[PDB]
Design a protein around this nucleic acid. Structure first.
Ligand code: NA
Ligand code: NA
Ligand code: NA
Lengths: 92, 102, 101
DNA sequence: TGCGTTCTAGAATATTCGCGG
DNA sequence: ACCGCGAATATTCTAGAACGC
């Protein structure tokens, strides 16, 4: 599993980040509750940038889609099912 | 068991090196906690060099893989390596680790 | 503060690192201007690299050097050379090419 | 024939920028 | 500003290759 996916799983799963990024209620998507604080305070703790656009570029590269707080989903990104991450293949 | 693996086992297992190189908390991988001091103060006591890169090349020659460190963005952090046959309390598995041949 | 806008960031930053005097404690031209020296690989990687790049790994700095065609000149300084990386000849930087595998 | 050290390269992922809309 | 996406470069991790023993 590439670093982006395992870090993203950790971010969403960990409760100590839940003020800015968390599973949706049913566990099928994740929410960014405060984009600006997420990008300025959380992104540089796990990635080499503080740029929401570079996070979103990676979401696109891994096939995530925005859901109509911002919400993203991937069929193989589900609460309690980290074994499924191996199914997610980055775009070339 | 070639010298690299027995020396690596002793390095990880020994408590007195644990500031530099230690089992991870699950015992399925090992950590190098201070890469610079490990390379300059530990490596040349066990090997003919003081270069982390030459240690790392050997780790990969023996089939070890680097573990992603989750909380690494932006006092250097740990580096973690794992091998299915390098496990705390299971030194009987070391004989199964065969170096790649060039 | 690097400033060679016409070449990739790595070469512009490398030129500034070598040329600027306040970094000469870490990285500087060799005496004849034909190569550059990293004087203390440990201090350079920990104190200088993350001020200019998104990492503090000598190996990733060296990967870039080789990718742009630099060769190591074979404890102490490490020395790297490129025919087109030369003191007083910044017009040659744009002849340095990034290798493609 | 195999192991150790060094230097360089392959390939994948990661970050940024810019384009058209 | 967004949004999807191509492209250039950066960074990481592993491997190739030369050479000594
Ligand atoms: Na969370
Ligand atoms: Na130890
Ligand atoms: Na300098």
């Amino acid at each position: 599993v590439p670093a982006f996916l395992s870090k993203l799983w950790t971010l969403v799963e960990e409760t100590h980040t839940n003020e800015f990024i968390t599973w949706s209620q049913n566990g099928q998507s994740f929410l960014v509750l405060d984009e600006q604080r997420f990008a300025k305070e959380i992104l540089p703790k796990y990635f080499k940038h503080n740029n929401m656009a570079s996070f979103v570029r990676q979401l696109n590269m891994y096939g995530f889609r925005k859901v109509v707080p911002v919400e993203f989903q991937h069929p193989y990104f589900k609460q309690g099912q980290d074994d499924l991450l191996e199914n997610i293949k980055r775009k070339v």
